[PDB]
């Protein structure tokens, strides 16, 4: 009931042993009381890394999208090493979503080593299990065995109805994932451990389908974009290898489903000036001239009977002489050209009325006239060429035209393919004009280039008219164990890709949220704009060039920081060599860098002078020691990891406050939320996520089926809690419910339509479904229902929630009215109370933790000691937590080397991995999440508690308590101990 | 949307009268041409004599026989009479509509890609 | 509980050797954050195994070399007593000599 | 009671009989996936002979039922896994012990 404090462990040790005499009865009692539970106590175990590789094929349907929606691929496994590195080899094949699938090396959900199907955004098929949301469900197959050498796994995905299906060795699998969210794009992905060898089969040249694709499906190799090429690449990464060494990389920009849909601008609706019958007629004449000259250059001739094979022009007249189905076609395309030009922000009309008088045409010899003769002189347009603004106009006109064409195609049902299949109603141009390659863009522009050249030749009046910050910013820093507060230090940073790089020195108190240079904590230099940032910005020197190196260096002997580029010392506007001066030591400084999307750069701390370039020019001969020179092991660094995780209420938060009033008569204990700065300057408003720190867990077995009654109180299973919404707060943007331990949606535009949901349907060999399980990361109720159920009423909205831990059902009520929304869950599941709210008044919400008649309060549910005490209580451990988007994490010292190549046309792509790697995982029981033990270096409180826990282990093991020693051998293993001794970090 | 519905192509002895009616229902705009195509089981769709709104008829190598074509823009109806039947002539026939006129387009690839095929019908020669 | 004695013996011996080399070298990144953490746990493990008696005659000879190569020799490297050491290392080494 | 679930097929003919000693590399965890035993980290096979009932009944019967070269999962109820008599410090009195066992080298 009072958190994890080491002083109580000290008390327990004192109870165990004192004055060299150990009370065996007390030691056995403490051991039997706390060790067998394996809860309320930190736990560690051996794990291995898991690496996932995608096929670089993105498919997903949307409204107006060009995706086919029925895809199929195959994977072959030929080398599996069972029980490698004293752990079962991981190997899974499936599909993953582009958004939400963010694997990281080490850690993650569960105990660690998350593969595909360990998150709701991913779905995997093991040898005989279906993996979704870190949940494994056994599936029946004709051959029930794990992934083995010489095995074939066929995966087929359908988007029209949300279906994922698998097939093993030709035997179809009667377990399919259904009713999943279609937001985003889906790509193939294989997760694996060491000692694996597989080959992809994507169809066509890249792999071959040993089994025929299901009818209506298409091979995945034909979904590649025109300018894209097939190449294996990680989902996202913050590091890469290069000739100099480790090159840190920023975020990876990726396409979205909304990019596939063509979004044009309406043009035909807009009226046009009366220039159409004066000057647009001459432009149409010029187009006729140029077209006739194209045929003249070709083998075409003037034959009145139209015959493409015989090269005969139907009109066969110098003047185009085209009839209404032909002349009006030309006139209307020119008219639509002007409509598009006006719609895209430009003008239509004349500016120079003597310009067409200046135009003199180009006279050509009679050889151009062939057969009847169709040579009109090309009107010379060299008088006015295409300005860059005019070229942009041509580009936008081509975009809009191809865009309206593509939307017409999609409305007809045209679906994009890498190849051109009109019989299947598919083109390589079905992607928007922006998504086209340079060839198709050129083909859809050149004619409009001629048209705009005609426009200019006549002299026309035409004239051209929050969380994203973390998604587009990545931060790396030196570990806080190397906080130097004196001396003269040099370190170099090479920026291989030009971008908004910010490299410099930062104080140990740098918040992950604050950008570099926006605060005084870091003296950074952003050379993309060529300025230096420290609590602002100021011009400094010149921007670098792609591949330049900057020698960021500091002297606390002189209390200054300077930046040099390629051995050239950067000057300020006044000419001062030092970028900053008067820099007090304070709390010290640490190397730091900030990278943007699609950006790469090496960071050399200066460990080796031989590889330290430009040191003689910049640092040497000035008394400036290279940083980390005497380091033997590589310097450990820390990266800003973007993953939403709940964190408690900061009592010093400038905008929100939480109060804890309890013990009032006729009112249960309650936690009140207030907005400190509402109705004032800088009153930020956005969706706020809150949850209670302790969860409630359902029974492992679902073996069901005035003055409260004491027997019903003792025998009841239901639990109740309420939320009070105050007046002033709109009942529309209020939410009350429960969240799974794997909810990481930090959406500022959050909605109940954005919750993850998936239906796992299990059938038999005959195909008859017998299981219809449902999984979701959030079980919470719509706020429009509350606002409908109810000007603002002074009555505080009371939202009651009832949960049965034995039967497994969830019911919601509003102000004494029972809502129709019911929920059913599975045994052995833990849920956290949570509310999502929009600040609309000074006082908004209040958790009421109480009890009803014959209903047991949540205090019993959380606490075993109070499991039978009807009085509701709020112990200090129970706190409120909101969701932090981005935090700090520690990069691994070593990275797995997986070798992937293209074996051949028949063999597809060969992927192999045989490098072992084993770190240690520390698992939090209540939060259901794991961390590396080495990450505890910066977390001293957890380190202190763990050290005192080990001391408690020794105390209960003291004086040769051999039974307790054996019990401890179960938790703390010989291999774990040996690896801990062998560890150096 | 411009949907072209095609009906006809009865089976009987060679030389039997076969008239195919295709009507193009859709936006009246960009309706100036009318193509025809034939593909036999297992071979490509070659162009039939294509007529455009100005009653401009373009023949090809596959017009061997009688292929009387007659169109009408009053209700976007086109009748193709391949009343001559030959063993090679057996094919699925399709009717196509497009803005491109007289099989040419100074505009370029957009309008070119602006094709609107139809449901078609089957023709067999016995 | 039964643990393989000899493999752990060789592992701890090579740990001790490399730790002595690293400590003799001037390094600003000591194992465990200090010379104390670099050696004292290793010294406790080696002393416990030595009184345990698992160390062979060759291993004891090597440990004598670690103590002082010049004094313990049979018919450059720094002896374990030569460099500056913390009081815990001093006490563990005194236990070894005892 | 007890439940058996094969994970990767074995020989299927060499069923162990009374008077034979088997070596297994097993991994035992609690109901909620809480590991408590493993021979994979001990770096030594677990040796047991059938007939002397020195091991819990669930484990001996599970080993006796299945053949050589087979890896499987054994759901042993407390009733066959020490019952309410549990172990102080580790194996909770009321707990269904799950084992991931594999059988090799019958003698």
Q: How many contiguous H segments (helices) and E segments (strands) does chain D have?
A: 1, 7
Nearest chain A residue (CA) to D94 = A36
- The alpha carbon of residue A361 and the mean position of all alpha carbons in its chain are separated, in whole angstroms, by 58
CB A576 within 8 A of CB A459: no
Contact B58 A308 (CB under 8 A): yes
Pick C28's closest partner by Cβ from A631, A982, A984: A631
Contact D8 A145 (CB under 8 A): yes
What is the CB neighbour count within 10 angstroms for residue A365? 7
Pick A330's closest partner by Cβ from B58, B106, B113: B106
Nearest chain B residue (CA) to A336 = B107
What's the token pair of residue B93?
């026939």
Three-class secondary structure of residue A339 per DSSP: helix
The whole-angstrom separation of Cα A85 and Cα A492 is 39
D79 phi and psi, to 5 degrees? -55, -35
The whole-angstrom separation of Cα B89 and Cα B39 is 9
Range list of H helices, chain B: 109-112
The whole-angstrom separation of Cα A168 and Cα A185 is 25
CB A739 within 8 A of CB A96: no
CB B37 within 8 A of CB B93: yes
Query: A436 vs chain B: nearest CA distance in angstroms?
Result: 13
Q: Tell me the residues of A at the C interface, defined by beta carbons under 8 Å apart.
A: 481, 630-633, 965-966, 969, 974, 978, 981-982, 984
Burial of A397 (0-12, 13-18, 19+ CB in 10 A): buried
Sheet (strand B77-81) strand order? B3-7, B19-25, B77-81, B68-72
A970 phi and psi, to 5 degrees? -65, -45
On whether any CB of chain A is under 8 Å from the CB of C28, the answer is yes
Burial of A479 (0-12, 13-18, 19+ CB in 10 A): middle
Beta-sheet strands, E only, within A875-928: 880-890, 899-904, 908-913, 920-924
Name the catalytic one among D4, D48, D56, D91: D56
User: How many C-alpha atoms does A295 have within 13 Å on its Cβ side?
Assistant: 30
What is the CB neighbour count within 10 angstroms for residue A319? 12
The whole-angstrom separation of Cα A601 and Cα A497 is 7
The whole-angstrom separation of Cα A320 and Cα A374 is 8
Which chains does chain B touch, 3 or more C-beta pairs < 8 A? A
Nearest chain C residue (CA) to A967 = C1
Contact B106 A309 (CB under 8 A): no
CA distances from A354 to A282, A535, A725 (A): 14, 58, 74
CB B4 within 8 A of CB B96: yes
Look up residue A214 and give its DSSP letter.
P
Instruction: Give the closest residue to A891 by CA, choosing from A468, A478, A379.
Output: A478
Contact A978 C8 (CB under 8 A): yes
Query: A70 vs chain B: nearest CA distance in angstroms?
Result: 23
Contact A631 C45 (CB under 8 A): no
What's the token pair of residue A643?
């993953």
Sheet (strand A122-125) strand order? A51-53, A186-192, A91-97, A122-125, A129-132, A135-138
Three-class secondary structure of residue B112 per DSSP: helix
Query: A377 vs chain B: nearest CA distance in angstroms?
Result: 16
Spatial neighbors of A58 by CB under 8 A, at least 6 apart, are A98, A185, A186, A187, A223, A255
The whole-angstrom separation of Cα A541 and Cα A535 is 18
Contact A36 D87 (CB under 8 A): yes
Nearest chain D residue (CA) to A968 = D89
CB A593 within 8 A of CB A501: yes
Q: Are strands A688-692 and A880-890 parallel, antiparallel or unpaired?
A: antiparallel
Contact A87 D41 (CB under 8 A): no
Instruction: Give the closest residue to A187 by CA, choosing from A100, A363, A335, A59.
Output: A59
Class of domain D1-107: alpha beta
| D4 catalytic per annotation | no
Instruction: Give the closest residue to A41 by CA, choosing from A973, A925, A698.
Output: A925
- The alpha carbon of residue A186 and the mean position of all alpha carbons in its chain are separated, in whole angstroms, by 13
What's the token pair of residue A970?
């179960």
Name the catalytic one among D50, D98, D99, D100: D99
Query: A48 vs chain B: nearest CA distance in angstroms?
Result: 54
Nearest chain C residue (CA) to A629 = C28
The whole-angstrom separation of Cα A933 and Cα A937 is 8
CB A197 within 8 A of CB A910: yes
Pick B102's closest partner by Cβ from A306, A401, A422: A306
On whether any CB of chain D is under 8 Å from the CB of A145, the answer is yes
Nearest chain A residue (CA) to C42 = A981
Phi-psi region of A715 (alpha: psi -120 to 50; beta: other; left: phi over 0): alpha
Nearest chain A residue (CA) to B116 = A412
Contact A36 D31 (CB under 8 A): no
Question: B–D contact (≥3 CB pairs within 8 Å)?
Answer: no
- The alpha carbon of residue A308 and the mean position of all alpha carbons in its chain are separated, in whole angstroms, by 54
Three-class secondary structure of residue B73 per DSSP: coil
Q: Which residues share a beta bridge with A602?
A: A247, A494
Burial of A18 (0-12, 13-18, 19+ CB in 10 A): exposed
CB B72 within 8 A of CB B51: no
Contact A325 B106 (CB under 8 A): no
What's the token pair of residue C83?
């460099």
The whole-angstrom separation of Cα A847 and Cα A880 is 10
Straight-line distance from the first to the last Cα atom of chain C, in angstroms, rounded to the nearest whole number: 28
Burial of A389 (0-12, 13-18, 19+ CB in 10 A): exposed
The whole-angstrom separation of Cα A501 and Cα A670 is 48
The whole-angstrom separation of Cα A731 and Cα A840 is 10
Residue that is written with structure tokens 């106590």 in the block: A41
Query: A223 vs chain B: nearest CA distance in angstroms?
Result: 20
Look up residue A83 and give its DSSP letter.
T
The whole-angstrom separation of Cα A529 and Cα A510 is 23
Chain B positions touching A269 (Cβ under 8 A) are none
The whole-angstrom separation of Cα A99 and Cα A121 is 8
Spatial neighbors of A747 by CB under 8 A, at least 6 apart, are A687, A754
CB A433 within 8 A of CB A463: no
On whether any CB of chain A is under 8 Å from the CB of D44, the answer is no
Chain B positions touching A290 (Cβ under 8 A) are 106
Burial of A588 (0-12, 13-18, 19+ CB in 10 A): middle
- The alpha carbon of residue A329 and the mean position of all alpha carbons in its chain are separated, in whole angstroms, by 48
Three-class secondary structure of residue A371 per DSSP: strand
On whether any CB of chain B is under 8 Å from the CB of A306, the answer is yes
Q: Which of C10, C22, C29 to mutate to test the interface with A (most CBs of A within 10 A)?
A: C29
Task: Find the Cα–Cα–Cα–Cα dihedral A269, A271, A277, A281, rounded to 10°.
Answer: -50
Q: Are strands B77-81 and A246-249 parallel, antiparallel or unpaired?
A: unpaired
| D46 catalytic per annotation | no
Residue that is written with structure tokens 């359908």 in the block: A158
| D7 catalytic per annotation | no
Nearest chain A residue (CA) to B32 = A325
Instruction: Give the closest residue to A774 by CA, choosing from A93, A120, A99.
Output: A120
| Core vs surface per residue A707-744: b (16+ CB within 10 A) or e | eeeeeeeeeebbbbbbbbbbeebebebbbbbbbbbbbb
Structure obtained using? cryo-EM
The whole-angstrom separation of Cα A474 and Cα A471 is 8
Pick A974's closest partner by Cβ from D42, D86, D88: D42
| D100 catalytic per annotation | no
CB D53 within 8 A of CB D60: yes
Chain A positions touching C8 (Cβ under 8 A) are 978
Question: B–A contact (≥3 CB pairs within 8 Å)?
Answer: yes
What is the CB neighbour count within 10 angstroms for residue A573? 9
Contact B52 A325 (CB under 8 A): yes
Three-class secondary structure of residue C90 per DSSP: helix
Q: Which residues share a beta bridge with A196?
A: A80, A913
Contact A83 D40 (CB under 8 A): yes
| Core vs surface per residue C73-92: b (16+ CB within 10 A) or e | eeeeeebbeeeebeebbeeb
Contact A83 D43 (CB under 8 A): no
The whole-angstrom separation of Cα A447 and Cα A600 is 40
Straight-line distance from the first to the last Cα atom of chain A, in angstroms, rounded to the nearest whole number: 34
Breaks (C-N over 2.5 A) in chain A follow: 465, 705, 790
Three-class secondary structure of residue A358 per DSSP: helix
Straight-line distance from the first to the last Cα atom of chain D, in angstroms, rounded to the nearest whole number: 28
CB A693 within 8 A of CB A816: no
Instruction: Give the closest residue to B67 by CA, choosing from B17, B117, B5, B8.
Output: B17
On whether any CB of chain B is under 8 Å from the CB of A573, the answer is no
Pick A964's closest partner by Cβ from D7, D34, D89: D89
Instruction: Give the closest residue to A121 by CA, choosing from A107, A138, A108, A106.
Output: A108
The whole-angstrom separation of Cα B79 and Cα A539 is 76
Question: C–B contact (≥3 CB pairs within 8 Å)?
Answer: no
Q: Which residues share a beta bridge with A788?
A: none
CA distances from A333 to A19, A447, A796, B56, B102 (A): 102, 12, 64, 20, 15
What's the token pair of residue A95?
């599909």
Taking a contact as any Cβ pair under 8 Å apart, which residues of chain A between 29 and 58 contact chain D?
A: 31-32, 35-38, 43, 45-46
Contact A447 B102 (CB under 8 A): no
The whole-angstrom separation of Cα C36 and Cα C38 is 5
Query: A405 vs chain B: nearest CA distance in angstroms?
Result: 6
What is the CB neighbour count within 10 angstroms for residue B113? 20
Q: Are strands A488-495 and A625-626 parallel, antiparallel or unpaired?
A: parallel
């Amino acid at each position: 009931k009072h958190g994890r404090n080491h002083k109580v462990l000290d008390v327990l040790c004192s109870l165990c042993v004192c004055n060299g005499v150990a009370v065996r009865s007390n030691q056995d009692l403490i051991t039997e009381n706390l060790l067998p539970g394996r809860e309320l106590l930190l736990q560690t175990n051996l794990i291995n890394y898991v690496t996932s590789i995608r096929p670089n094929i993105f498919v997903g349907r949307a409204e107006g999208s060009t995706q086919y929606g029925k895809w199929y691929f195959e994977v072959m496994v030929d080398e599996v090493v069972p029980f490698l590195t004293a752990q079962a080899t991981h190997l899974r094949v499936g599909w993953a979503l582009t958004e939400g699938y963010s694997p990281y090396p080490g850690g993650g959900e569960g105990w660690g080593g998350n593969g595909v199907g360990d998150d709701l955004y991913s779905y995997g098929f093991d040898g005989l299990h279906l993996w979704t949301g870190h949940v494994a469900r056994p599936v029946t197959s004709p051959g029930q065995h794990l992934l083995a050498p010489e095995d074939v796994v066929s995966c087929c995905l359908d988007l029209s109805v949300p279906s994922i299906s698998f097939r093993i060795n030709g035997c179809p699998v009667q377990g399919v994932f259904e009713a999943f969210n279609l937001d985003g794009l889906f790509f193939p992905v294989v997760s694996f451990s060491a000692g694996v060898k597989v080959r992809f089969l994507l169809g066509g040249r890249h792999g071959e389908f040993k089994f025929l694709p299901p009818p209506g499906y298409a091979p995945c190799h034909e979904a590649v974009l025109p300018r894209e090429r097939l190449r294996l690449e990680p989902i996202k990464e913050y590091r890469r290898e290069g000739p100099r060494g480790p090159h840190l990389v920023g975020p990876s920009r990726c396409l979205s489903h909304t990019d596939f849909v063509p979004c044009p601008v309406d043009t035909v609706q807009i009226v046009l000036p009366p220039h159409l019958e004066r000057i647009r007629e001459k432009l149409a004449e010029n187009i006729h001239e140029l077209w006739a000259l194209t045929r003249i250059e070709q083998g075409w001739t003037y034959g009145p009977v139209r015959d493409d094979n015989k090269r005969l022009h139907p009109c066969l007249v110098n003047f185009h002489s085209l009839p209404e189905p032909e002349r009006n076609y030309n006139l209307q395309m020119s008219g639509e050209t002007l409509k598009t030009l006006l719609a895209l922000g430009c003008h239509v009309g004349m500016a120079d009325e003597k310009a067409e008088d200046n135009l003199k045409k180009t006279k050509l010899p009679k050889t151009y006239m062939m057969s009847n003769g169709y040579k009109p002189a090309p009107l010379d347009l060299s008088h006015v060429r295409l300005t860059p603004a005019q070229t942009t106009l041509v580009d936008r006109l081509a975009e809009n035209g191809h865009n309206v064409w593509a939307r017409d195609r999609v409305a007809q049902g045209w679906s994009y393919s890498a190849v051109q299949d009109i019989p299947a109603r598919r083109n390589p141009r079905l992607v928007p004009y922006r998504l086209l390659d340079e060839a198709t863009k050129r083909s859809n522009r050149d004619s409009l280039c001629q048209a705009v050249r005609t426009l200019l030749g006549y002299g026309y009046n035409i004239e051209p008219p929050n969380q994203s910050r973390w998604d587009r910013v990545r931060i790396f820093r030196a570990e806080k164990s190397y906080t130097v507060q004196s001396g003269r230090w040099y370190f170099e940073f090479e920026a291989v890709t030009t971008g908004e790089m910010r490299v410099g020195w930062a104080r140990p108190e740098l918040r992950p949220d604050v950008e570099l240079g926006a605060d005084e904590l870091a003296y950074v230099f952003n050379g993309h704009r060529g300025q230096r940032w420290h609590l602002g910005s100021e011009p400094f020197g010149r921007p670098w060039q792609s591949g330049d190196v900057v020698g960021c260096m500091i002297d606390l002997t002189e209390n200054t920081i300077i930046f040099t580029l390629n051995g050239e010392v950067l000057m300020s506007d006044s000419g001062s060599e030092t970028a900053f001066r008067e820099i007090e030591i304070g709390d010290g400084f640490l190397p730091v860098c900030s990278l943007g999307p699609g950006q790469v750069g090496h960071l050399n701390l200066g460990q080796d002078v031989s590889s330290l370039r430009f040191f003689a020019i910049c640092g040497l001969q000035e008394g400036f020691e290279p940083f980390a020179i005497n380091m033997q092991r590589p310097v450990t660094t820390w990266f800003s990891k973007s993953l939403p995780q709940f964190e408690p209420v900061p009592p010093e938060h400038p905008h929100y406050e939480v109060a804890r009033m309890d013990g009032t008569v006729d009112t249960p204990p309650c936690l009140r939320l207030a907005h400190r700065t509402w109705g004032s300057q800088n009153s930020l408003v956005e969706m706020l996520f809150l949850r209670l720190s302790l969860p409630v867990q359902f029974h492992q077995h679902f073996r069901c089926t005035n003055r409260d009654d004491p027997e019903i109180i003792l025998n009841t299973t239901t639990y109740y809690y309420s939320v009070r919404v105050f007046a002033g707060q709109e009942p529309s943007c209020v939410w009350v419910g429960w969240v799974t331990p794997d909810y990481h949606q930090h959406d500022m535009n959050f909605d109940l339509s954005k919750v993850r949901a998936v239906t796992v349907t299990m059938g038999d060999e005959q195909g008859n479904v017998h299981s219809s399980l449902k999984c979701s990361n959030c079980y919470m109720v719509w706020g429009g229902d509350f606002v409908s159920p109810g000007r603002i009423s002074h009555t505080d909205l009371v939202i009651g929630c009832l949960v049965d831990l034995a039967t497994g059902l969830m019911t919601f009520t509003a102000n004494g009215k029972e809502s129709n929304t019911f929920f059913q869950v599975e045994p052995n599941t833990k849920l956290f109370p949570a509310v999502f709210v929009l600040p609309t008044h000074q006082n908004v919400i209040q958790f009421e933790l109480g009890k009803q008649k014959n209903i047991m309060p949540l205090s019993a549910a959380m606490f075993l000691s109070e499991r039978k005490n009807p009085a509701p209580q709020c112990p200090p451990r129970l706190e409120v937590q909101m969701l932090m988007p981005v935090s700090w994490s520690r990069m691994p010292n070593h990275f797995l080397q997986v070798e992937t190549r293209r074996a051949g046309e028949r063999l597809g792509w060969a992927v192999q991995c045989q490098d072992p790697l084993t770190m240690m995982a520390l698992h939090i029981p209540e939060e259901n999440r794991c961390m590396d033990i080495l990450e505890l270096s910066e977390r001293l409180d957890l380190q202190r508690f763990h050290s005192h826990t080990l001391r408690l282990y020794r105390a209960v093991c003291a004086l040769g308590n051999n039974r307790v020693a054996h019990a401890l051998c179960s938790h703390v293993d010989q291999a774990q101990l040996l690896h801990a001794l062998e560890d150096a970090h | 949307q411009v949907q072209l519905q095609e009906s006809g192509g009865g089976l009987m002895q060679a030389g039997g009268s076969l008239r195919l009616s295709c009507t193009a229902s859709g936006s009246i705009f960009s309706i100036n041409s009318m193509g025809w195509y034939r593909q036999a089981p297992g071979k490509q769709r070659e162009l039939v004599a294509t007529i455009t709104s100005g009653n401009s008829i373009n023949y090809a190598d596959s017009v061997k026989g009688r292929f009387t074509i007659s169109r009408d823009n009053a209700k976007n109806t086109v009748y193709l009479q391949m009343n001559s039947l030959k063993p090679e002539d057996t094919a699925v026939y399709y009717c196509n509509a497009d803005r491109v006129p007289n099989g040419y387009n100074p505009w370029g690839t957009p309008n070119d890609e602006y094709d609107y095929w139809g449901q078609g019908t089957q023709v067999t020669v016995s | 509980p039964a643990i393989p004695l000899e493999a752990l013996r060789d592992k701890a011996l090579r740990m001790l050797g490399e730790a002595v080399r690293d400590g003799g070298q001037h390094a600003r990144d000591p194992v465990g954050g200090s010379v104390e953490f670099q050696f004292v746990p290793v010294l406790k493990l080696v002393s416990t195994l030595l009184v345990m008696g698992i160390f062979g005659d060759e291993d004891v000879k090597q440990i004598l070399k670690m103590i002082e190569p010049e004094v313990f020799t049979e018919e450059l490297e720094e002896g374990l007593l030569q460099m500056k050491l913390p009081e815990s290392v001093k006490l563990q080494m005194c236990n070894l000599l005892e | 009671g007890v439940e058996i679930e094969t994970i990767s097929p074995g020989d299927g003919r060499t069923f162990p009989k009374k008077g034979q000693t088997c070596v297994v590399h097993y991994t035992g965890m609690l109901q909620n996936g809480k590991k408590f035993d493993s021979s994979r980290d001990r770096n030594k096979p677990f040796k047991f002979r059938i007939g002397k009932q020195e091991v819990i009944k669930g484990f001996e019967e599970g080993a006796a039922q299945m053949s050589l070269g087979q890896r499987a999962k054994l759901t042993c109820t407390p009733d066959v896994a020490y019952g309410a008599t549990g172990h102080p410090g580790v194996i909770p009195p009321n707990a269904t012990l799950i084992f991931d066992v594999e059988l090799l080298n019958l003698e």
